[PDB]
Amino acid sequence: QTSAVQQKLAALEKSSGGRLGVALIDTADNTQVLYRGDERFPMCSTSKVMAAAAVLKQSETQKQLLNQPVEIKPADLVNYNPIAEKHVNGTMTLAELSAAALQYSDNTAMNKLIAQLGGPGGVTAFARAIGDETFRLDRTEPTLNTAIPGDPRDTTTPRAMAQTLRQLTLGHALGETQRAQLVTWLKGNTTGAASIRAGLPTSWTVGDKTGAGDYGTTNDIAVIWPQGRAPLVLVTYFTQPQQNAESRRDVLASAARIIAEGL
Ligand SMILES: O=C(Nc1cccc(-c2nn[nH]n2)c1)c1cc(C(F)(F)F)cc2[nH]cnc12
Numbered sequence: 001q002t003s004a005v006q007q008k009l010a011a012l013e014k015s016s017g018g019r020l021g022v023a024l025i026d027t028a029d030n031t032q033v034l035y036r037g038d039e040r041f042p043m044c045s046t047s048k049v050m051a052a053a054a055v056l057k058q059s060e061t062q063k064q065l066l067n068q069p070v071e072i073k074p075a076d077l078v079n080y081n082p083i084a085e086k087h088v089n090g091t092m093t094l095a096e097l098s099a100a101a102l103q104y105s106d107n108t109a110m111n112k113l114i115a116q117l118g119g120p121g122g123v124t125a126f127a128r129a130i131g132d133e134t135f136r137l138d139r140t141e142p143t144l145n146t147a148i149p150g151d152p153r154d155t156t157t158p159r160a161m162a163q164t165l166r167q168l169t170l171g172h173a174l175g176e177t178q179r180a181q182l183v184t185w186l187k188g189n190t191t192g193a194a195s196i197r198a199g200l201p202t203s204w205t206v207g208d209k210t211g212a213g214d215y216g217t218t219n220d221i222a223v224i225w226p227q228g229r230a231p232l233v234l235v236t237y238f239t240q241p242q243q244n245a246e247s248r249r250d251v252l253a254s255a256a257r258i259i260a261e262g263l
Pocket residue numbers: 079080104105191210211212213214247
């Protein structure tokens with residue numbers, strides 16, 4: 001069937017000229033609302049959540065791992081490194097790298113997380129370990145954001161990512177202290193006010209991770225604590241036909257508004 005919410009998401013998508021993917025899980029009843037929920041989309045920096053979570057999982061058996069220093073060299077800087085560039089010729093701890101990747105979207109920090117896991121395939125291996133058979137990370141930063149239509153590299157589906165984000169932030173994929181740390185990091189994101197959050201009532205609490213890439217790819221994944229109800233998990237992915245297309249965070253806000261209105 002096609003629901004009223006799905007029809008509105010299709011109208012939004014048509015007006016936008018692009019391709020929109022949405023997955024909601026309402027933990028009040030475990031129900032799901034999906035739009036293109038099983039189509040693949042480039043994750044871009046939303047993949048930083050899986051990398052940080054994989055390091056958190058490693059830290060469950062190494063109490064000092066998050067305090068471990070990682071050298072930052074001039075050659076490690078890539079295209080967007082607002083935190084890491086302050087530490088060139090010095091070090092950052094794995095906690096600092098996780099916070100920078102998640103809250104500032106630092107690409108050098110992400111590359112250090114990937115390297116700690118043995119490469120992109122180590123991130124994929126963690127996804128499989130927590131029951132996500134769909135996620136794949138194939139490249140490092142910045143090339144994982146090429147976002148080429150039809151390219152399976154560095155993609156997932158909205159359904160899979162919503163399920164994984166629920167397990168990581170509200171479920172038991174991580175230990176309790178690690179889950180709390182991930183939630184704290186997401187709630188402190190600096191980059192999210194124009195994306196999912198912009199479509200939701202201001203009283204609601206949001207933790208999210210944004211992403212963007214070529215093909216005007218504009219993404220956000222969020223855990224949401226609405227006023228007076230159980231938490232929601234919402235993924236909004238958007239990509240466009242031309243390589244140079246402009247970002248469209250407003251489309252993500254509009255999708256979130258349609259979802260909220262449909263609860
Ligand atoms: O850093 C960014 N973009 C960037 C930097 C360097 C190079 C290129 C690029 N390379 N080839 N095409 N574009 C792109 C960026 C950062 C952020 C952030 F994290 F919120 F600050 C949001 C964004 N939305 C679209 N782009 C961004």
